[PDB]
Amino acid sequence: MVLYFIGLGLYDERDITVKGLEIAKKCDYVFAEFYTSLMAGTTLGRIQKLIGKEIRVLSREDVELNFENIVLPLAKENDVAFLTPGDPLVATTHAELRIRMKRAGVESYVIHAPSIYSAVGITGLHIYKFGKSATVAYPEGNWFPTSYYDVIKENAERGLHTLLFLDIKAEKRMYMTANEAMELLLKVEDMKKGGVFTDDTLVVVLARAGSLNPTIRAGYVKDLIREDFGDPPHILIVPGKLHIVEAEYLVEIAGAPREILRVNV
Amino acid sequence: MVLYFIGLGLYDERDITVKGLEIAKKCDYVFAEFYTSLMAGTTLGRIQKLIGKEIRVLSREDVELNFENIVLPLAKENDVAFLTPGDPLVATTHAELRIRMKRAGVESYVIHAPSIYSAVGITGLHIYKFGKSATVAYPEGNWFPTSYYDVIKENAERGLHTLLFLDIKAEKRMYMTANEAMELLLKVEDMKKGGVFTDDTLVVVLARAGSLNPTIRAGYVKDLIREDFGDPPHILIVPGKLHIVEAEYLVEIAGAPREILRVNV
Ligand SMILES: Nc1ncnc2c1ncn2[C@@H]1O[C@H](CSCC[C@H](N)C(=O)O)[C@@H](O)[C@H]1O
Ligand code: NA
Ligand SMILES: [Pt+2]
Ligand SMILES: [Pt+2]
């Protein structure tokens, strides 16, 4: 009868909510996708064991082109679950999926889970101060995306922080590191020369949020661009004018240079 | 003392994550606070029953002024859990708390949970398009705050959505409804004449996020300002120019007027 959008959380299979687990356990069919993000702390096997169901993993093409062709033949007889990393509707196009299903006569429910979008709070940066978000995409051939640079510019001018989701090619097992995003940004700066992202820009890196020991680091690009932040996933943040308490957190928790406390300079 | 910040999630006692529940059960002492927000879909008794541990509630004062005298000296040699609605560290007081503990030589870990910041994704509005967020506070005495109005203007001006939290008196359990928020915003519009919030402005109201049956409504102020959105807490969002996909989602899921497909896209 119905379709469940169930988020699995940030890091591992335990990041799912109790609500999500109890509902997943009782679904007749369980589908999942693992291309919108990376859950570096678990495996398909562990998730299957926790839920006690066999999980059919879908590729991006299966979902975007054949979702209703794969699910309709079931959702019309049985309860179906669709599992995704983090929160199913955050920084994905899965919301549009609910539209398809509804037009096809299948009602759906969403079960939220920890998302990187709110997890940024662990960096000490005021979540309300974040502005428009962007994604740093891998260049492809001659195509070199650069719009994320303009987003940073617009937010920074307003004194707002910029959350930069990093690119991922799940089928090639390529997960963009914060180091790589910084290299790409330095190159876009070299081209545009807007003084938006340079060696002296203060950035914040959050790696593997959701794990008990995520990597939280802050400092100037020149010092962090070659630093090892551990395995992916990574998220990069370009803060705006800092609040003193934001600077305190970055210094005391993220090991930032004590000089940022002079938010005046 | 190792301190575990554990988020309780959006609505009820099942919104905590499997990870949070298990860690909370392993902790010798479990504290909680419900002053930053309330868990409107459940009760302390129900959360206590699920966690299977005695839950010691702490007031805003207990936390901000005496946390080191209550939690620490109690949990000399043990692990302590501190339960908070939503996702820990989203609220500023939690981040400050972590800094304080670190200075006191106390290490802490964070177990994330769904936050309203990511949950709003259920409105169909793309998360990347949200800009600076703000809170609508009641005017009182000789004080009439209006900054939240400027936040809307700056965001919408750039085609960004504005997430608006509504005033809450946790201790007294009093909430500002979306209706009241709308009246206040119109009152501010009359004072500023910015053409930012009027009877023709498109807004979205979200209530009981986390619940399996949340209330998601979209429409013009003139139509929504007297609608019954149910029990608080409510969340008000003033979107910017809509993506056609966003608009279709609002029409088909949040019952928005077909009219938005040509007026707000
Ligand atoms: N646990 C994590 N730690 C650090 N970054 C993460 C992360 N999870 C996701 N990200 C970031 O977000 C990108 C995927 S976008 C999908 C986000 C997911 N829907 C959610 O709600 O969390 C990743 O490439 C990475 O840039
Ligand atoms: Na935001
Ligand atoms: Pt989208
Ligand atoms: Pt919250």
Curated annotation (Swiss-Prot), chains A, B:
GO BP terms in the entry: methylation; protein histidyl modification to diphthamide
Residues engaged in binding S-adenosyl-L-methionine: 10, 87, 90, 115-116, 166, 209, 234
Pathway terms, separated by semicolons: Protein modification; peptidyl-diphthamide biosynthesis
CDD domains: DHP5_DphB (cd11647)
SUPFAM superfamilies given in the database record: Tetrapyrrole methylase (SSF53790)
Gene Ontology molecular function: any one: diphthine synthase activity
Entry-linked Pfam families: TP_methylase (PF00590)
Keyword terms, alphabetized: Methyltransferase, S-adenosyl-L-methionine, Transferase
Reactions catalysed: 2-[(3S)-amino-3-carboxypropyl]-L-histidyl-[translation elongation factor 2] + 3 S-adenosyl-L-methionine = diphthine-[translation elongation factor 2] + 3 S-adenosyl-L-homocysteine + 3 H(+)
InterPro entries: 4pyrrol_Mease (IPR000878), 4pyrrol_Methylase_sf (IPR035996), 4pyrrole_Mease_sub1 (IPR014777), 4pyrrole_Mease_sub2 (IPR014776), Dphthn_synthase (IPR004551)
Enzyme class: transferase
Enzyme Commission number(s): 2.1.1.98
Family: Belongs to the diphthine synthase family.
Miscellaneous comment: The diphthine intermediate is not stable in vitro and readily eliminates the trimethylamino group. It is not known whether the elimination reaction also occurs physiologically.
Its biological purpose: S-adenosyl-L-methionine-dependent methyltransferase that catalyzes the trimethylation of the amino group of the modified target histidine residue in translation elongation factor 2 (EF-2), to form an intermediate called diphthine. The three successive methylation reactions represent the second step of diphthamide biosynthesis.
Subunit (UniProt): Homodimer.
Name of the featured protein: Diphthine synthase
Gene that encodes the chain: dphB
